[PDB]
C-alpha cells in the first residue's frame, strides 16, 4: 500500500524518476495536454492520446510510464468536486506531477492541491515557473492615465480599455474629441481596444494574444470583472503579446511582478 502525499521537489526532472518513472499528465476532452504537463516530455511519442480523441472527464489514457487524465474545465462548469472525481480515476501509486488546471479562470493553487490530497496517490511536484516572467517583469510600470493614453499615441501601441470604466471614456472623449467608441479594434491615429466586463477576461487575453501586438494596458480583469489584482496577474501570465502593465500605485509594482513570477 502507498502513502498518499504530496511532496513538492527542487531536483531535476531525471533524479526525480530514480524514485518514480511514472508521469501523471493532464489533457482537455480532445487529448491536448495543459501546457504544465507537456514540459514534463523528454521526446516521448504522444500519438497514443491523439488516437482516441474525444474522451469523457476522467478518462485515463496510458502508455509507458506516462498516464493522461482528462480532467474538466471552469470554462465548461468543471468544480473542485469534479477535478477530485477525477484524479481518483487514476490508479493508486507513485507519479511525478504538476499542479493542474492553474492556468486564466482555471483552478486556484489550493483547488489544485485539495483533488491531489483526496486521492491516495503519492506525488512529486516539480516547479512550473511562469513562461517569459522574467520578461513581463520589465514591462510593469505604475502611470497614471494620462501618462498611458500619451505613451501610447507617442509610440502607435494598442491600448486596451474596458468600457464599463466611464472616469476612462471620459477622458479618453475629452482628449480625442469624436473618437468613434465601439467594442473591439478603433484606430485614428491612437488606437484602442475596448471591452466589457461581459466579456470572460480569458476572452480578451485570447485576442489580445491573437493581434499579437504591443500593448499598454492595466492588468485585465482587476476591479472590473471582480478580479483582485492577484487574480488579474494569474491571467496576465496568459498575454504572449509585448506588453507594458501599468499598477495602480508603485507599491503595487513589487507585489503584482511578485505574482507574475510565482510557481
Ligand atoms: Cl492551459
Ligand atoms: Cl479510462
Ligand atoms: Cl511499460
Ligand atoms: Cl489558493
Ligand atoms: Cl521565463
Ligand atoms: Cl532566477
Ligand atoms: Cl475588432
Ligand atoms: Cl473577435
Ligand atoms: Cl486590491
Known sequence: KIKACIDEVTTTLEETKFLTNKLLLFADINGKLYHDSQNMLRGEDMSFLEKDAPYMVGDVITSGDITCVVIPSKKAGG????????????????????????????????????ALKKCKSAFYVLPSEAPNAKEEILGTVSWNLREMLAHAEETRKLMPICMDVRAIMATIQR??????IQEGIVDYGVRFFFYTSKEPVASIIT????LNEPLVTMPIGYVTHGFNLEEAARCMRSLKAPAVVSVSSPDAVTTYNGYLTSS
Not at 175 to 180: E, F, L, V
Not at 207 to 210: D, Q
Open 207 to 210: 485576442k489580445l494574444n491573437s
Open 79 to 114: 468544480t473542485t468536486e469534479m477535478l477530485s472525481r477525477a484524479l481518483k480515476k487514476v490508479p493508486v501509486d507513485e507519479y511525478i506531477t504538476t499542479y493542474p488546471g492553474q492556468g486564466c479562470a482555471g483552478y486556484t493553487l489550493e483547488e489544485a492541491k485539495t
Open 175 to 180: 482628449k480625442y474629441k469624436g473618437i468613434k
